[PDB]
Design an enzyme around this catalytic site. Structure first.
Site, short mmCIF file in Angstrom:
data_model
loop_
_atom_site.label_atom_id
_atom_site.label_comp_id
_atom_site.label_asym_id
_atom_site.label_seq_id
_atom_site.Cartn_x
_atom_site.Cartn_y
_atom_site.Cartn_z
N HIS A 23 83.28 40.51 1.90
CA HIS A 23 82.15 39.94 1.09
C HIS A 23 82.99 39.55 -0.10
N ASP A 59 92.00 8.02 -8.93
CA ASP A 59 92.07 9.04 -8.00
C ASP A 59 92.91 10.06 -8.72
N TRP A 94 88.97 44.82 -1.56
CA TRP A 94 89.76 43.16 -1.87
C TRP A 94 90.98 43.45 -2.59
N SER A 105 97.27 26.63 -1.39
CA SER A 105 96.29 25.71 -1.59
C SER A 105 95.92 25.63 -2.85
N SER A 106 95.45 26.67 -3.74
CA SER A 106 95.21 26.41 -5.18
C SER A 106 96.52 26.09 -5.86
N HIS A 166 93.33 40.19 -13.33
CA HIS A 166 92.53 39.56 -14.40
C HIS A 166 92.37 38.20 -14.57
N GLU A 204 92.52 35.94 -12.45
CA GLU A 204 91.67 35.52 -11.56
C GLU A 204 90.32 35.28 -11.90
N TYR A 259 89.21 34.93 -14.81
CA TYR A 259 88.71 33.95 -15.82
C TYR A 259 89.06 32.74 -15.17
N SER A 261 78.82 23.77 -20.92
CA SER A 261 78.75 22.89 -21.91
C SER A 261 78.26 21.53 -21.49
N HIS A 265 93.62 47.31 -17.63
CA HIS A 265 92.32 47.69 -17.96
C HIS A 265 91.82 48.15 -16.49
N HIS A 266 92.41 47.84 -15.50
CA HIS A 266 91.88 48.21 -14.17
C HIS A 266 92.56 49.33 -13.72
N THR A 268 85.20 34.32 -26.49
CA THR A 268 84.03 34.13 -25.78
C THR A 268 82.87 34.02 -26.47
N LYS A 326 82.28 30.42 -27.96
CA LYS A 326 81.59 29.67 -26.88
C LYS A 326 80.00 29.95 -26.80
N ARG A 354 81.96 53.87 -6.32
CA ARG A 354 82.16 52.41 -5.37
C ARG A 354 82.77 52.73 -4.05
C1 HEA Z 1 81.73 35.51 -6.65
C2 HEA Z 1 81.57 36.76 -6.33
C3 HEA Z 1 80.39 37.52 -5.85
C4 HEA Z 1 79.23 37.34 -5.48
C5 HEA Z 1 78.52 35.85 -5.75
C6 HEA Z 1 78.47 38.49 -5.15
C7 HEA Z 1 77.18 38.77 -4.63
C8 HEA Z 1 76.70 39.73 -4.20
N1 HEA Z 1 77.20 41.15 -4.11
FE1 HEA Z 1 79.31 41.45 -4.35
N2 HEA Z 1 80.92 41.95 -4.68
C9 HEA Z 1 82.08 40.96 -5.21
C10 HEA Z 1 81.77 39.72 -5.49
C11 HEA Z 1 80.60 38.99 -5.36
N3 HEA Z 1 79.38 39.59 -5.13
C12 HEA Z 1 83.41 41.69 -5.10
C13 HEA Z 1 84.57 41.27 -5.84
C14 HEA Z 1 83.24 42.94 -4.95
C15 HEA Z 1 83.94 44.14 -4.66
C16 HEA Z 1 84.68 44.48 -3.34
C17 HEA Z 1 85.70 45.61 -3.37
O1 HEA Z 1 85.04 46.87 -3.89
O2 HEA Z 1 86.60 45.66 -2.64
C18 HEA Z 1 81.52 43.03 -4.49
C19 HEA Z 1 81.08 44.29 -4.17
C20 HEA Z 1 79.62 44.39 -3.82
C21 HEA Z 1 78.90 45.73 -3.80
C22 HEA Z 1 79.68 46.99 -3.79
C23 HEA Z 1 79.82 47.58 -2.63
C24 HEA Z 1 80.32 48.91 -2.73
O3 HEA Z 1 81.26 49.36 -3.52
O4 HEA Z 1 80.33 49.87 -1.54
C25 HEA Z 1 77.68 45.43 -3.63
C26 HEA Z 1 76.55 46.07 -3.37
O5 HEA Z 1 75.41 46.05 -3.47
C27 HEA Z 1 77.72 43.87 -3.80
C28 HEA Z 1 76.36 43.28 -3.42
C29 HEA Z 1 76.08 41.92 -3.62
C30 HEA Z 1 74.80 41.20 -3.46
C31 HEA Z 1 73.75 41.68 -2.79
C32 HEA Z 1 75.21 39.84 -3.87
C33 HEA Z 1 74.12 38.86 -3.80
O6 HEA Z 1 73.87 38.46 -5.17
C34 HEA Z 1 74.56 37.48 -3.28
C35 HEA Z 1 73.26 36.28 -3.17
C36 HEA Z 1 73.92 35.09 -2.82
C37 HEA Z 1 74.51 34.16 -3.46
C38 HEA Z 1 74.42 34.35 -5.02
C39 HEA Z 1 75.29 33.12 -2.84
C40 HEA Z 1 74.89 31.81 -3.02
C41 HEA Z 1 75.84 30.55 -3.30
C42 HEA Z 1 76.00 29.67 -2.20
C43 HEA Z 1 75.42 30.23 -0.94
C44 HEA Z 1 76.47 28.19 -2.36
C45 HEA Z 1 75.50 27.31 -2.40
C46 HEA Z 1 76.25 25.95 -1.97
C47 HEA Z 1 76.15 25.05 -2.99
C48 HEA Z 1 75.44 25.05 -4.38
C49 HEA Z 1 77.22 23.83 -2.91
N4 HEA Z 1 78.92 43.37 -3.87
C1 HEA Z 2 83.56 36.13 -13.96
C2 HEA Z 2 84.46 37.06 -13.59
C3 HEA Z 2 84.47 38.18 -14.88
C4 HEA Z 2 84.87 37.70 -16.21
C5 HEA Z 2 84.59 36.66 -17.05
C6 HEA Z 2 85.11 39.33 -16.84
C7 HEA Z 2 84.88 39.52 -18.02
C8 HEA Z 2 85.42 40.80 -18.63
N1 HEA Z 2 85.60 41.87 -17.98
FE1 HEA Z 2 85.46 42.23 -16.29
N2 HEA Z 2 85.58 42.44 -14.28
C9 HEA Z 2 85.22 41.70 -12.92
C10 HEA Z 2 85.14 40.00 -13.30
C11 HEA Z 2 84.88 39.65 -14.57
N3 HEA Z 2 85.20 40.38 -15.93
C12 HEA Z 2 85.74 41.93 -11.90
C13 HEA Z 2 85.58 41.28 -10.59
C14 HEA Z 2 85.96 43.54 -12.03
C15 HEA Z 2 86.05 44.48 -11.21
C16 HEA Z 2 87.36 44.34 -10.14
C17 HEA Z 2 87.54 45.32 -8.92
O1 HEA Z 2 87.85 46.47 -9.55
O2 HEA Z 2 87.26 44.82 -7.95
C18 HEA Z 2 86.07 43.77 -13.43
C19 HEA Z 2 86.55 44.59 -14.08
C20 HEA Z 2 86.51 45.02 -15.14
C21 HEA Z 2 87.24 46.05 -15.88
C22 HEA Z 2 87.64 47.47 -14.91
C23 HEA Z 2 86.79 48.32 -14.97
C24 HEA Z 2 87.08 49.49 -14.11
O3 HEA Z 2 87.52 49.04 -12.99
O4 HEA Z 2 87.01 50.80 -14.51
C25 HEA Z 2 87.22 46.11 -17.37
C26 HEA Z 2 87.75 46.80 -18.22
O5 HEA Z 2 88.14 46.63 -19.40
C27 HEA Z 2 86.44 44.81 -17.64
C28 HEA Z 2 86.52 44.15 -18.92
C29 HEA Z 2 86.12 42.83 -18.99
C30 HEA Z 2 85.63 42.12 -20.61
C31 HEA Z 2 86.00 42.88 -21.70
C32 HEA Z 2 85.59 40.74 -20.32
C33 HEA Z 2 85.37 39.79 -21.29
O6 HEA Z 2 85.89 38.70 -20.94
C34 HEA Z 2 83.85 39.46 -21.52
C35 HEA Z 2 83.85 38.75 -22.91
C36 HEA Z 2 82.44 38.58 -23.46
C37 HEA Z 2 81.38 38.91 -24.05
C38 HEA Z 2 81.67 40.16 -25.07
C39 HEA Z 2 79.92 38.44 -24.29
C40 HEA Z 2 79.89 37.05 -25.21
C41 HEA Z 2 80.34 37.25 -26.60
C42 HEA Z 2 79.37 37.68 -27.74
C43 HEA Z 2 77.86 37.10 -27.69
C44 HEA Z 2 80.14 37.89 -29.02
C45 HEA Z 2 79.90 39.11 -29.55
C46 HEA Z 2 80.29 40.27 -28.92
C47 HEA Z 2 80.90 41.37 -29.26
C48 HEA Z 2 81.00 41.74 -30.87
C49 HEA Z 2 81.48 42.54 -28.75
N4 HEA Z 2 86.48 43.98 -16.46
CU LIG Z 3 90.47 42.52 -15.98
#
Ligand code: HEA
Ligand code: HEA
Ligand SMILES: [Cu+2]
Ligand SMILES: CCCCCCCCCCCCCCCCCC(=O)OCC(COC(=O)CCCCCCCCCCCCCCCCC)OC(=O)CCCCCCCCCCCCCCCCC
Ligand SMILES: CCCCCCCCCCCCCCCCCC(=O)OCC(COC(=O)CCCCCCCCCCCCCCCCC)OC(=O)CCCCCCCCCCCCCCCCC
Ligand SMILES: CCCCC/C=C\C/C=C\C/C=C\C/C=C\CCCC(=O)O[C@H](COC(=O)CCCCCCCCCCCCCCCCC)COP(=O)(O)OCCN
Ligand SMILES: CCCCC/C=C\C/C=C\C/C=C\C/C=C\CCCC(=O)O[C@H](COC(=O)CCCCCCCCCCCCCCCCC)COP(=O)(O)OCCN
Ligand SMILES: CCCCC/C=C/C/C=C\CCCCCCCC(=O)O[C@H](COC(=O)CCCCCCCCCCCCCCC)COP(=O)(O)OCC[N+](C)(C)C
Ligand SMILES: CCCCCC/C=C\CCCCCCCCCC(=O)O[C@H](COC(=O)CCCCCCCCCCCCCCC)COP(=O)(O)OC[C@@H](O)CO
Ligand SMILES: CCCCCC/C=C\CCCCCCCCCC(=O)O[C@H](COC(=O)CCCCCCCCCCCCCCC)COP(=O)(O)OC[C@@H](O)CO
Ligand SMILES: CCCCCC/C=C\CCCCCCCCCC(=O)O[C@H](COC(=O)CCCCCCCCCCCCCCC)COP(=O)(O)OC[C@@H](O)CO
Ligand SMILES: C[C@H](CCC(=O)O)[C@H]1CC[C@@H]2[C@H]3[C@H](O)C[C@@H]4C[C@@H](O)CC[C@]4(C)[C@@H]3C[C@@H](O)[C@@]21C
Ligand SMILES: C[C@H](CCC(=O)O)[C@H]1CC[C@H]2[C@@H]3[C@H](O)C[C@@H]4C[C@H](O)CC[C@]4(C)[C@H]3C[C@H](O)[C@]12C
Ligand code: CUA
Ligand SMILES: [Mg+2]
Ligand code: NA
Lengths: 46, 259, 514, 79, 227, 84, 58, 79
Positions: free
Chosen positions: C61, C91, C126, C156-157, C240, C242, C244, C255, C290-291, C316, C319, C438
């Protein structure tokens, strides 16, 4: 040279909306169905 | 007619054959590692070679033969090569990180020391020092080759380039021999792991770099390069210096400091 | 002609279309996988089997949603389509190499599907951490097919990154400085720089896992003096950045959407927006640990990572407030795209804020590896990234196809999805605070209510995904051709009509240097 | 004699969460001391402290593996 | 343990977990304030027919929205780091217990004086005694003395696992070849539950931790009899 | 540093050739002299079956699965010791 | 050797509407056909291998 | 017992002309051992070898200065 314009800049045809519905159904349906059938595959091995 | 200086490339089959060859090589490695068969791998390696040969052949046709490399196009290729080299540097960084992580905090299984108990490192003052003088020397000869080309000297460009290539081959042969002679192997814990994977990927880059230089040597023999336009040679030289610098870091880190 | 056009393409528009198609298909796969996850957790007990088949599903997933849906759509799809048009380029710099970045994805996807077909699949998460991912706990080809899948997606990326950076730096009109390019173009370049620097580290790391599994190396095996924690550092150093990479192009599209539907000619504080994205990109490389707050690191290292992580909230925040300041005084057009963007602003903020809660290593001791983390990332990904993709898709669909969607149906789609994702993920905060781990196929009885509600919300989202497919069909079925678009003076990508001709900007734009 | 030990006390040399070296160090120390005493004609009771500390901190399988290796002649540490 | 419909943290059993609860209340208030301020502002921007579409200057308002969040982040970091260092304080334990994670159960070792060790498996649902918790009970609990500073050492003999007890504010990864340390100190007697917190394969969901906190006296008797 | 030489009035082809033959190649000739002097096969150490060496978690995909890729009988012992 | 680039420039600029990868002549065609055949054939073979590995051979 | 010492034998740890650390190491070793034995209730005779080696190698003034410093509490080495 290639065809240009609405409905011509794509790899699929939109000439017939029903043929298109069939296409889209197979396209998106096959994607959504795949995980279910792989889960079935894994359960039917052991 | 276009009124910009950029290159609109003819539809090509190489991106597809290249992607498929990647599938065949990875599929191939899996088949080899788990189902004891090299068939897929062999096909993958072959189509990969064919793809690269034809793709780069076409780039030569587009530039030397058709004149599509205007200054703007060449500028882009420069950025492209620098960016590629940057990504290669980061790839090696991961291996150095693994090396330092293991060596700076030797675990109890190693005897809590580095090098591990039972490991007898090569003498960095022997073949490894020779390898170092070989690559540094090729860095000087390739610079002579570059200046000769810019000065319009065909004979000396070929001479310098030939010397550069001979040196790269010499390094390769020396390393091959060192690998065979080494008392330790890739399976000898983290010492052998870090040593062979890092120097192994480096050796691969030396082979790639030498091949790139050989391509330049033959394009030079065929008068492809002008005293002012020869990006293929510049890229080959930048890549060669990169290979040289990575070696210096390996030498200092793994062979010298890590012994 | 069909093969020359679609298999041998060297056109940025067609290649972007291929990416959009691939990403849409991938999204269906990822949605199915998420339904299987929530079906398993929908009621106490075991539905499919033990944690292995369950986690093979969870792992796939994540890989599908991240590597095959989000990245291909945002970067390969919108990036390829819009970047050249927004800078008036004919292009991409390397149009042929661009085609290879695309064609590497289907093989990459095939390897991922193969890994779940052979043996018992790769139920590793993952993150693919050893020793669970090693050759003793996960013997067989599964994990190796997964690593190869990542290698192909990685190449690819990386090539895609080289192409975008070169195009953006080298192919703008002579008079246009970097400070005159649209924010989406800036978002793509920064994303490309993060990809270029991070993926090679991931590649190094997974290659070492590959050798540990097949060539008897011991990088992560203590018996040979290795360390499993080394893998975590290498992975997260890429991991991390990734996240961003997943949100930056989203910020860029937001924007454009907010500016466009506010009836504004420009986003508020352009230079502050560029500064914010660059800062975020930079800070994103020095916070990875932090992970790893529970792996046993020194307290000073943990104090540093806590502090460094919170700083990102500053750029952030600039923005977020700038998007609000762009809405300020606008003649607001309540189009479906605007709705997605407004939902993004609020929901992303919530997800970002819970990220700041997690940044505290003290608190993270208790929240780590619990559903509080899952809640956090689904708000930023399933609501943030996804809403940006939906907003951009409805906004630019008329440009790419030449046809208009039915706005009312699009607003209905947004409403359903909004309820679905919130019902799915909001309750997960409670499950996390209260201790639900989890990657569990079943849970203690006390967690039943919230898991039940969460699974129902996931079905609502499924309904929205099905509706979206119908909506796209309806647009192509009715064929309402675009005539005119407003604000073309500040949205160059629309200036060549809908859809623009195969070749655009054969004669470059004229821009005075003054 | 100067004992009455409850458990291994805090050791400023190993003040962090990773205690692997603390266990290892004390194990080495005991076996080094035990070898010195058994050699020069002395009593192993002086090596008591190290024995208590490593016994307290080290996982049984670690001590067992290390003991098997010292006997096999494959213990990598210096004793 | 967690109870039905729980919204927040399990009640604090140790002084440090109490500390975290107050820190979380502090942080959550800020999260609620900022998120609702943003939602409010969105609604404010969208509810007026008045317009201003010409260029707006930014080097003035950006000072405000840079300094404010900076101050707020410091207000969170201060108590967060105070707690962080507090958890690292030298305390000198009265007992050291080790736990080894295994593919699907935990083993414990109390080897300060005697060489005591046992395995701890989840009680299968089909074997639970009436009133016992599904997925949470184990055959052999971790008997420990209450109101005493205990040093827990965690490791694993196979893959990664993670030893957690939410009510005590504990979670320490179990990594093979590494000995991680954490300190435990219960303010009360009782039974405290936790679950494996690092994906470890087939039965990751089924290898719980159960601590039994009793007075010193009982701990000692238990020690002896478990020989 | 500035080396211990001089030129710099204009670094060209002649100068780089001068460096190639007057400094670079002579250095390589010396290191080649040094190396093909300090060579000589060193007496292989006694075999000790250390558990952190000669790792075998999965057989190699070649030969009998127990020999490393560039196995040298003379200096690389198998997990069971040197070969005959 | 002699400089024959001009000859090659003439050949590759010849207005025959051929894409650069086939403009060299008949050999380009052959090499292309060999490349594509090995690619597609090898892909079919990999699919077969996946089908084989997908099932247990107990 | 196990002695019959003529002079300090070659020590592979100090194979060079500079022998300063050889003297220092053995001086430290003796005083560390002497402290361990006198502490845990044992006999200093086990420390004999180190005493003979450092006495043979170390200049009288060095030993004398180090002794004065251990007494004064200013010995910089760890004992
Ligand atoms: C982009 C990343 C992404 C997205 C969108 C989602 C979406 C969803 N995920 Fe998540 N999920 C992950 C990334 C994501 N997840 C990751 C990184 C993990 C952790 C894996 C791990 O632990 O190893 C995870 C784990 C995870 C868990 C925890 C599993 C566990 O710990 O046992 C669960 C549980 O409910 C869950 C549920 C869902 C559900 C219900 C949605 C629903 O919201 C989905 C609804 C459908 C959509 C939002 C897709 C729509 C988009 C399109 C179809 C494109 C359309 C086409 C055009 C516009 C061109 N996800
Ligand atoms: C789109 C993807 C995305 C983005 C943008 C972020 C953004 C951030 N993430 Fe998240 N993060 C994930 C995807 C993402 N994360 C995923 C996939 C995991 C789990 C991975 C895994 O284990 O599988 C994860 C896990 C994760 C962890 C690990 C937790 C754990 O495993 O125990 C932590 C730890 O600090 C963290 C922190 C943050 C922070 C601080 C930001 C910051 O960038 C957010 C900053 C934004 C704001 C704060 C809001 C806007 C700000 C304002 C309105 C201003 C005023 C605010 C203040 C004064 C506070 N993230
Ligand atoms: Cu991180
Ligand atoms: C897998 C594919 C399913 C096949 C079904 C098709 C059957 C055809 C019969 C055939 C009958 C012939 C009729 C001919 C005309 C039209 C049909 C077409 O030509 O047939 C094919 C065409 C067209 O596609 C279709 O057929 C219908 C698609 C409709 C899509 C609507 C999308 C709307 C969203 C907006 C998109 C952006 C563009 C909008 C903007 C406009 C653009 C500018 O596609 C392509 O050739 C290129 C697509 C490439 C990649 C997409 C995803 C692939 C994933 C594969 C990974 C597998 C891993 C292993 C996984 C193995 C599985 C276990
Ligand atoms: C569907 C789930 C049903 C659950 C209902 C709760 C049951 C109450 C029993 C009533 C029983 C009362 C007795 C229990 C008290 C114990 C207090 C405590 O120890 O427990 C502490 C817990 C619980 O917290 C509470 O003290 C309750 C807070 C509830 C907030 C609800 C927001 C609901 C929004 C509407 C739908 C959600 C989607 C919107 C997304 C909102 C963003 C998070 O703290 C948490 O960590 C939970 C939330 C964490 C992080 C999210 C922060 C962002 C909030 C955004 C606000 C938007 C406002 C605009 C308005 C939002 C407009 C959309
Ligand atoms: C423990 C260690 C681990 C292992 C270490 C291993 C190896 C060590 C590392 C490196 C050594 C290897 C090779 C070096 C030799 C040659 C490299 C090629 C450089 C060269 O020779 O390039 C030239 C110099 O330009 C230039 O640097 C132009 C600049 C480049 C432009 C492209 C980059 C764009 C990417 C974005 C950058 C962001 C920075 C912006 C500022 C804000 C950032 C905070 C010409 O090129 P051009 O593109 O036309 O530019 C036009 C500008 N005159
Ligand atoms: C002569 C110097 C030049 C080095 C390379 C030349 C020949 C080897 C073949 C391919 C090497 C290419 C890259 C390196 C990959 C693994 C390390 C190999 C380095 C090497 O060659 O190491 C050898 C081990 O060989 C081994 O296992 C080799 C087994 C061969 C298996 C190849 C496995 C391929 C794994 C490739 C993964 C590639 C993924 C690449 C990702 C790139 C980014 C996406 C060492 O020999 P040994 O007997 O253990 O010790 C010597 C004792 N006398
Ligand atoms: C967590 C921390 C964050 C919390 C809170 C932050 C919110 C900030 C609150 C107030 C900001 C005050 C800005 C003051 C600017 C005055 C506005 C004005 O009136 O706008 C213009 C000024 O240009 C200009 O600065 C440009 C126009 C306006 C400039 C600023 C507008 C944006 C304000 C922000 C939008 C709301 C988003 C807030 C985010 C929280 C008007 O120009 P003049 O009168 O010269 O010409 C008109 C012709 N005359 C001369 C005949 C009248
Ligand atoms: C350079 C930037 C500015 C500098 C500011 C600081 C940021 C990075 C610093 C880089 C160099 C640091 C090296 C100092 C070593 C001190 C730490 C040390 O000693 O760490 C060791 C590993 O370091 C290791 O590999 C360290 C290896 C590298 C890890 C750092 C990650 C950055 C590398 C990628 C950057 C890409 C740049 C491209 C380069 C051309 C071992 O682990 P410990 O935790 O000690 O375990 C001991 C336990 O038994 C007890 O607790
Ligand atoms: C037996 C060993 C086989 C091993 C496999 C790899 C084998 C060989 C790799 C070597 C590749 C050689 C590349 C040949 C490039 C020839 C095309 C070329 O050099 O093309 C030039 C453009 O540069 C261009 O595209 C620049 C092109 C850049 C290509 C360089 C990329 C290196 C490839 C690395 C791949 C592996 C990655 C490492 C694995 C971890 C053409 O322009 P000019 O030169 O200015 O000419 C024009 C003048 O004539 C006008 O008057
Ligand atoms: C087995 C385990 C994993 C295996 C994965 C293998 C993946 C693919 C294998 C097949 C790829 C080989 C085919 C040759 C590719 C050459 C691309 C190239 O050379 O691209 C060039 C541009 O990139 C440039 O220069 C700048 C950069 C040159 C890039 C060289 C490409 C090497 C591909 C490997 C990349 C690995 C990434 C390295 C980081 C670890 C030319 O651009 P085009 O758009 O063509 O033309 C533009 C025209 O104007 C030219 O006249
Ligand atoms: C034939 C050509 C002269 C220029 C021309 O082609 O007209 C000469 C000049 C310099 C080149 C030579 C250079 O002197 C370098 C090399 C030295 C020799 O020992 C072997 C061949 C060697 C690799 C070259 C072969 C030779 O045929 C070249 C290619
Ligand atoms: C100087 C530079 C560009 C200005 C321009 O050339 O237009 C501007 C763009 C964004 C500005 C930054 C952002 O507005 C964020 C910060 C805002 C505070 O008001 C000062 C520092 C602060 C860090 C700013 C410093 C400086 O004024 C920046 C960096
Ligand atoms: Cu043990 Cu999860
Ligand atoms: Mg964890
Ligand atoms: Na279940």
């Amino acid at each position: 040279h290639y065809e240009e314009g609405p409905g011509k800049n794509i790899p699929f045809s939109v000439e017939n909306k029903w043929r298109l519905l069939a296409m889209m159904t197979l396209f998106f349906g096959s994607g959504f169905a795949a995980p279910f059938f792989i889960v079935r595959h894994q359960l039917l091995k052991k | 007619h276009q009124t910009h200086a950029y290159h609109m490339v003819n539809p090509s089959p190489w991106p597809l054959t290249g992607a498929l060859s990647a599938l065949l090589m990875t599929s191939g490695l899996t088949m080899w590692f788990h189902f004891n068969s090299m068939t897929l791998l062999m096909i993958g390696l072959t189509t990969n070679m064919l793809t690269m040969y034809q793709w780069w052949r076409d780039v030569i046709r587009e530039s030397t033969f058709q004149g599509h490399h205007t200054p703007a196009v060449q500028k882009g290729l420069r950025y492209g090569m620098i960016l590629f080299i940057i990504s290669e540097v980061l790839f090696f960084t991961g291996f150095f990180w693994a090396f330092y992580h293991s060596s700076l905090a030797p675990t109890p299984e190693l005897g809590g020391c580095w090098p591990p108990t039972g490991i007898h490192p090569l003498n960095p003052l022997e073949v490894p020092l020779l390898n170092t003088s070989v690559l540094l020397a090729s860095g000087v000869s390739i610079t002579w080759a570059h200046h000769s080309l810019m000065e319009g000297d065909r004979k000396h460009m070929l001479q310098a380039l030939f010397i550069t290539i001979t040196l790269g081959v010499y390094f390769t042969l020396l390393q091959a021999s060192e690998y065979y002679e080494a008392p330790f192997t890739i399976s000898d814990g983290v010492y052998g792991s870090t040593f062979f994977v890092a120097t192994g990927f480096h050796g691969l880059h030396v082979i790639i770099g030498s091949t790139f230089l050989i391509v330049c040597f033959f394009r030079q023999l065929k008068f492809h390069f002008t005293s002012n336009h020869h990006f293929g040679f510049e890229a080959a030289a930048w890549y060669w210096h990169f290979v040289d610098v990575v070696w210096l870091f390996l030498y200092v880190s793994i062979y010298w400091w890590g012994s | 002609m069909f093969i020359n056009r679609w298999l041998f393409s060297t056109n940025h528009k067609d290649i972007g279309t291929l990416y959009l198609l691939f990403g849409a298909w991938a999204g269906m796969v990822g949605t199915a996988l998420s339904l299987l996850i929530r079906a398993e957790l929908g009621q106490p007990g075991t539905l499919l089997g033990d944690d292995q088949i369950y986690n093979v599903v969870v792992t796939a997933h994540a890989f599908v949603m991240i590597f095959f849906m989000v990245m291909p759509i945002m970067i390969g799809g919108f990036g390829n389509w819009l970047v050249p048009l927004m800078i008036g380029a004919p292009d991409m710099a390397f149009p042929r190499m661009n085609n290879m970045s695309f064609w590497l994805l289907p093989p990459s996807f095939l390897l991922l599907l193969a890994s779940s077909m052979v043996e018992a699949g790769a139920g590793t998460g993952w993150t693919v951490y050893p020793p669970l991912a090693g050759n003793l706990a996960h013997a067989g080809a599964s994990v190796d097919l997964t690593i190869f899948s990542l290698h192909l997606a990685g190449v690819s990326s990386i090539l895609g990154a080289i192409n975008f950076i070169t195009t953006i730096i080298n192919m703008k009109p002579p008079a246009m400085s970097q400070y005159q390019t649209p924010l989406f173009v800036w978002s793509v370049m920064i994303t490309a720089v993060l990809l270029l620097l991070s993926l090679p580290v991931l590649a190094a790391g997974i290659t070492m896992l590959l050798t540990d599994r097949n060539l008897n190396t011991t990088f992560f095996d203590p018996a040979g003096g290795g360390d499993p924690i080394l893998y975590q550092h290498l992975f997260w150093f890429f991991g991390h950045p990734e996240v961003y990479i997943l949100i930056l192009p989203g910020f860029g599209m937001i924007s454009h959407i907010v500016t466009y539907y506010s009836g504004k000619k420009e986003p508020f504080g352009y230079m502050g927006m560029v500064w914010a994205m660059m800062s975020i990109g930079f800070l994103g490389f020095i916070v990875w640990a932090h992970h790893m707050f529970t792996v046993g690191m020194d307290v000073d290292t943990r104090a540093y990572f806590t502090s460094a992580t919170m700083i990102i909230a500053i750029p952030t925040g600039v923005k977020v407030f700038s998007w609000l300041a762009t809405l300020h005084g606008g003649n607001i057009k309540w189009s479906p795209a605007m709705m997605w963007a407004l939902g993004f602003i609020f929901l992303f903020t919530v997800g970002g804020l819970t990220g700041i809660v997690l940044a505290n290593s003290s608190l993270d001791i208790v929240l780590h590896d619990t559903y509080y983390v899952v809640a956090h990332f689904h708000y930023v990904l399933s609501m943030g990234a996804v809403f940006a993709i939906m907003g951009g898709f409805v906004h630019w669909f008329p440009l790419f196809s030449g046809y208009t969607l039915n706005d009312t149906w699009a607003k209905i789609h947004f409403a359903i999805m909004f309820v679905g994702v919130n019902m799915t993920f909001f309750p997960q905060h409670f499950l996390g605070l209260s201790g639900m781990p989890r990657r569990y196929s079943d849970y203690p009885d006390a967690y039943t209510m919230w898991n039940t509600i969460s699974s129902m919300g996931s079905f609502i989202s499924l309904t929205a995904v099905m509706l979206m497919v119908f909506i796209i069909w309806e647009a192509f079925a009715s064929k309402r051709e675009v005539l005119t678009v407003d604000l073309t003076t500040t949205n160059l990508e629309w200036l060549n009509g809908c859809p623009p001709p195969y070749h655009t900007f054969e004669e470059p734009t004229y821009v005075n240097l003054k | 004699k100067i004992k009455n030990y409850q458990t291994a006390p805090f050791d400023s040399r190993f003040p962090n969460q990773n205690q692997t070296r603390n266990c290892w160090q004390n194990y080495l120390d005991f076996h080094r001391c035990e070898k010195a005493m058994t050699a020069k004609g002395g009593d192993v009771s002086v090596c008591e402290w190290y024995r208590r500390v490593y016994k307290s901190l080290c996982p049984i399988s670690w001590v067992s593996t290390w003991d098997d290796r010292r006997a096999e002649g494959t213990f990598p540490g210096k004793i | 343990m967690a109870y039905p419909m729980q919204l927040g943290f399990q009640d604090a059993t140790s002084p440090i977990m109490e500390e975290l609860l107050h820190f979380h209340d502090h942080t959550l208030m800020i999260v609620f304030l900022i998120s609702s301020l943003v939602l409010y502002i969105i609604s404010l921007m969208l509810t007026t027919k008045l317009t201003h579409t010409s260029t707006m200057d930014a080097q003035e308002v950006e000072t405000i929205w840079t300094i404010l969040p900076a101050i707020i982040l410091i207000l969170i970091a201060l108590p967060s780091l105070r707690i962080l260092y507090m958890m690292d304080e030298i305390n000198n334990p009265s007992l050291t217990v080790k736990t080894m994670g295994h593919q699907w159960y935990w083993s414990y070792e109390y080897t300060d004086y005697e060489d005591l060790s046992f395995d701890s498996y989840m009680i299968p649902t089909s074997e639970l005694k009436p009133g016992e918790l599904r997925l949470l009970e184990v055959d052999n609990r971790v008997v420990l003395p209450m109101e005493m500073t205990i040093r827990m050492l965690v490791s694993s003999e196979d893959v990664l696992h993670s030893w957690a007890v939410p009510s005590l504010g504990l979670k320490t990864d179990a990594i093979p070849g590494r000995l991680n340390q954490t300190t435990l100190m219960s303010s009360r007697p009782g039974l405290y539950y936790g679950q494996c917190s690092e994906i470890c394969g087939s039965n990751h969901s089924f290898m719980p931790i159960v601590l039994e906190l009793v007075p010193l006296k009982y701990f000692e008797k238990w020690s002896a009899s478990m020989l | 540093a500035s080396a211990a030489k001089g030129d710099h009035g204009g670094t060209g082809a002649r100068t780089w050739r001068f460096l190639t033959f007057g400094l670079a190649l002579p250095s390589v000739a010396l290191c080649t002299l040094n190396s093909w002097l300090h060579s000589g096969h060193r007496e292989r150490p006694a075999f000790i079956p250390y558990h952190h060496l000669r790792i075998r978690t999965k057989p190699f995909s070649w030969g009998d699965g127990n020999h490393t890729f560039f196995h040298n009988p003379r200096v690389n012992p198998l997990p069971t010791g040197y070969e005959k | 050797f002699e400089n024959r680039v001009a000859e090659k420039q003439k050949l590759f600029q010849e207005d025959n509407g051929l894409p650069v990868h086939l403009k060299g002549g008949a050999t380009d065609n052959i090499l292309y056909r060999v490349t594509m055949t090995l690619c597609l054939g090898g892909t079919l073979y990999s699919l077969y291998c996946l089908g084989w590995a997908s099932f247990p051979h107990k």
